């Protein structure tokens, strides 16, 4: 339910969840591409401050 909870993880688990086909995966990856960030990062400051 948070973007930062999605940036720090890869899509190997995304396809594990059922009903996650080409549409959703491509949409998420293109949205994060337009946003510049990458799918799968490494940060320790999480979540500040929630």
């Amino acid at each position: 339910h948070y973007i930062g909870d999605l940036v720090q993880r890869t899509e190997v688990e995304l396809l594990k969840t059922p009903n996650l086909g080409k549409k959703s995966l491509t949409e998420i990856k293109d949205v994060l591409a337009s946003r510049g960030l990458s799918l799968g990062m490494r940060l320790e400051n999480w979540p500040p401050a929630s």
């Binding site: 899509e11 190997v12 491509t26 591409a33 799918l39």
Partner: protein, 164 residues
């Protein structure tokens, strides 16, 4: 539309200098750059139109590599065991269909790509036909003598060059 693609592939000007598989690959590259211009992102796609009769059925290349840059054409090795990829390079899959190959900008870029391809084809044909006469003497009128070099007519679309 397939009838028009046919009419084109069978009604080419130089059937010899431009073989059938060459027309196929030229149309494929033209429709590929058309589909590239379609999407705002950068994603490489071949059309693989049925060479003999049928219409197109595009694909979507994804370039298996651990990188993430331009994720439209990115698939990590670890997250690729699904769909029985199991490979390092060549994940050219059919995730993308519905190509439009007849609108205005697509037709213009296809005409441009066809011009480029027939020019490349005639160049390759003339060079690998008149290269056999590399040791012997060649006779022919000069097209035009420029400063850096001169260009010579050798026959049917046959060009040679002599340096300054």
């Amino acid at each position: 539309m397939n009838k028009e693609i046919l009419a084109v592939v069978e009604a080419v000007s130089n059937e010899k200098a431009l073989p059938r598989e060459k027309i196929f690959e030229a149309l494929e590259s033209a429709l590929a750059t058309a589909t590239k211009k379609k999407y705002e992102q950068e994603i490489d796609v071949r059309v693989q139109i049925d060479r003999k009769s049928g219409d197109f059925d595009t694909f979507r290349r994804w370039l298996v590599v651990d990188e993430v840059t331009q994720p439209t054409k990115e698939i990590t090795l670890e997250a690729a065991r699904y769909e029985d990829e199991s490979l390092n390079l060549g994940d050219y899959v059919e995730d993308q269909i519905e190509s439009v190959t007849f609108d205005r900008i697509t037709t213009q870029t296809a005409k441009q790509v066809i011009v480029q391809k027939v020019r490349e084809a005639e160049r390759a044909m003339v060079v690998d036909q008149f290269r056999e006469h590399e040791g012997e003497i060649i006779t022919g009128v000069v097209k035009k003598v420029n400063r850096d070099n001169i260009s010579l007519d050798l026959g049917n679309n046959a060009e040679a060059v002599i340096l300054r």
